[model samples]
Target: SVDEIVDGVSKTTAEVINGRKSIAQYATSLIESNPEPDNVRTIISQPLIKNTFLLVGFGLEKDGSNINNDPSWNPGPTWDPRVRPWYKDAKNAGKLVITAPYADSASGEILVSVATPVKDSATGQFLGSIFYDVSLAELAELVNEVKLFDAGYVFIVSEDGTTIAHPKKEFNGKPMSEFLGESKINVDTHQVIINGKPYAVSFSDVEGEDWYVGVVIDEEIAY
Candidate 1:
């Protein structure tokens, strides 16, 4: 049964890209003005960043997401502080903060954030962190409930090109690498090399924060 995979991808892509600009308030305009440490923490942790974030999100990169609610999730309580995607060097080089979408290895659902660093204005130090933690199932419900098209399914893919969330039930708690069997899935083209075959994929980017969102569709059903 062919589903509207592409259409679902399309909707997720558009929404994330449009929302990138709003994060700046957390990093600069807001962070810079703060005087107290706790106050700054309070500000960054507030809804401005957390509530606004649609992807599963986190900050500090230390405590990480509250995985107790879901043990099968990655970056769970064991989330390492060292795996930051945009951290060039913790103390020296200017931070390169990003917001990559995190997917559950078990559910294949996309809902979590990978925070990278952004440097401080005064010392050019790694000052702040920007991350994401979105609700993949919630997104699925949106697309599924609305039904982008007849038999259509909307799902997200990690940059690696596995089914994070899709219409199929078997893909939950798996890696894109396992499903595609290749690592070079193109975020720009949305094409993946599976068993040496090319597949097209959709992508969303938040350059300021160095984050991206990708969409995967069953090309066989729709392009």
Candidate 2:
């Protein structure tokens, strides 16, 4: 569901940021109008959900990072260069942001993200970048549909190598490497746990960013 929703948002971002719009002005409008929880109540499915027509996600580049002029930016750091240059390529090339899914090792949940750029109208220069973070914890409720070993549960992870969801009642801010570290375990489409429980792990990097997405699946779960 989040994929479908964010996929639609990626399209809207490509449209609004194109042409001669001020990158700063466009970026502000995008954040303010994003579906982020402006307040806790916003998460509730009540009638108070304001500005339901908004979509798209982006992050402004830090003033010092010259993402546009930097040739090395096509692939950059994951955490520091949280914003991606692909936004620039897409806008100038008339394309949309890329979409992908990653499962959190700690939380055993799934989330979606999009990479887009902010560009200046006058020079078509790049500003910062933006992306969307969507949580899929609730989606796990439908896990029974999968033919697991009757004891396995599914969870998601963040691109920064942390758990977004976990069945254990005591994990949230912990990093995935905490458990997967030095455990001689490799992550495949197959399960990545040891000792019949979770382990420290490192997710695949997001190319230049070295950002990894973790996921904790049942040790017995096959790829």
Candidate 3:
């Protein structure tokens, strides 16, 4: 059922966030172990689940310090993780968070940040943070796993209504309003005329996150 697919997608994304958040413990322990800068290559490299992340690392303090999975990926000493918006927000929340989609500086494709604050084991003071950088496009796997209606399909959107994932590659990263036109966006089953055809779409917000999953219905076939 399309509704179950929507619910599954919503729940799966929620699970995706929780699992990665707990992985912070390994990075936290690695940082706390106080490895020599040279061994940073040896220790941190093995644990990072490569290919799943653009990068993962620990950022130490206000002045400026970050160590990534690869030594060569350095952003230069001028970069301050303490001053980063993701860093500040995650730390202030005292937990993990998934950031709203933001335009990628390099590729222009949107990106989502998964981050958490780390603290010193002894003093329980801010030691730094652990973060995962991912392309929002990759998250498509979560929403695109629909049972797939024969004449219809599923789409996911960000809080801004920008399409995050869709079957047509061209549609991803564009606004849901492109399909909506004059129709106001809402979570109910509403019909909108799109490209000279009427489409009935049902979408709902993923709990605790700013994402929404929507399904297109075929009048003849039904979702």
Candidate 4:
């Protein structure tokens, strides 16, 4: 399960960060280590920790000098680690932070990042953060693979209303309002009408994040 995997990874990242005494030593080891790159798209740490920005992943050079010069791999000079959504969320929450599903620039695949801040357990001083970029296509596949007879299916949406996963590939990235129009969905009632057809909708939060899964069925078959 993606949720379980994220939980385990989050805990492990925190432990790894806190267990090490030196941030620069840890970052250098990660860069030099041979990890399975396919599953871990990237491991990035902020510059605040050791005064060295770190980015190591599949698309990076084998020598770990720099990320590949390809246009898709470049994050540009303006990119700031502290300003990233996951970083801000984790800093504010002071715990594990799971970001909404997004497209990975290097792979062009749906992905999510789980991040946590590193703090000294004794003094409670902020050290840095460890972020893991994980692929979300498998989770999306599970969402789209669900069945509720033939006319009912499951989908997912972020709190902001953007579709995260759907049976229709084209709908996966669009806003829910684009399908149901404004004011059509009632979270309280859990119902909406789409394309002149009534649907009984139910939603549940995706634990640890502001995303949700929606199960919808034709009104005629709902009750």
C-alpha TM-scores of all predictions = 0.49, 0.33, 0.77, 0.53
lDDT of 3 by residue, 7-118 (tens): 6666776666556555654555666576455554454566455565777766777546777785556675456677765677678877777666565433556666677777
Which has the higher TM-score value, candidate number 2 or candidate number 3?
3
Over 4 Å off, model 4 = 1-80, 101-111, 134-136, 169-174, 182-185, 188-191, 206-208, 219-223
How many residue pairs of model 1 clash at the backbone? 23
Residue 15 shift from truth in candidate 3, angstroms: 3.2
| Ten-residue stretch with the least lDDT total in model 1 | 62-71
Q: Which has the greatest TM-score?
A: 3
**Model with the higher TM-score, candidate 2 or 4:** 4
Q: Tell me the spans in candidate 2 whose CA falls farther than 4 Å from its real position.
A: 1-115, 127-131, 139-147, 157-161, 167-170, 177-185, 188-223
For candidate 1, lDDT tens digit of each residue in 1-223?
1223444445455555345434633443455455245555555555555555543222343344221122234464555534544222322233323334444444554444434354455775544454444454554454355443242244555545544454454453345555555455444544565556555554554233332334444455553
Enumerate clash totals for all models, in the order shown.
23, 30, 0, 0
Candidate 4 lDDT by residue in tens digits, 51-135: 2222222222122223311224555565445555545555576666556666654455555555555454457655444445543
lDDT of each: 0.44, 0.36, 0.65, 0.49
Task: List CA RMSD, all candidates.
Answer: 7.9, 13.4, 3.5, 10.4
